[PDB]
Each structure stands twice: as structure tokens, then as C-alpha cells.
């Protein structure tokens, strides 16, 4: 395995859960907003969001 420059040694989560910043339930729809933040030196793939 490569021993350097492929993984951080800093405290970083591999999983993050974004709670809604606003939500409103309608009569047949549910609307949920979030603030999805990507920190500096973190790259996110949208494949892995659900």
C-alpha cells in the first residue's frame, strides 16, 4: 500500500449526517432543505449521498 499522500492523519469523519435546516409538511408532499457543507481539503462524491 502507498504509505503517504493517500490518507489524512487529521481528525476527519468518513460519514456526516446533515439534519434539515428547514422542513415543511404539505398535504401530499414533504419539503426538506439542508445545508450540505464540504470542508477545505475534503472532496465529496454525490454517489455516496442518500
Amino acid at each position: 500500500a502507498p504509505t503517504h499522500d493517500v490518507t489524512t492523519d487529521r481528525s476527519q469523519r468518513l460519514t456526516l449526517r446533515f439534519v434539515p435546516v428547514d422542513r415543511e409538511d404539505n398535504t401530499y408532499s414533504y419539503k426538506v432543505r439542508y445545508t450540505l457543507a464540504v470542508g477545505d481539503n475534503r472532496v465529496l462524491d454525490m454517489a455516496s449521498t442518500y
Binding site: 500500500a1 502507498p2 493517500v6
Partner: peptide, 26 residues
Amino acid sequence: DINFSSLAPRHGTRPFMGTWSDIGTS
């Protein structure tokens, strides 16, 4: 076909001694 040419760079794997390593942008 139905549309799928949405593929990678047509590189090959990087050369090494001892099967694997990482070289990044080199």
C-alpha cells in the same frame, strides 16, 4: 447502444516495482 460512452480517461495503470504504489500528479 442506449447512451453509455460516458467513460474514464483512456489511460493505462502507472508503472511500478513490487506491483503497487502512488505517484499522484508526477
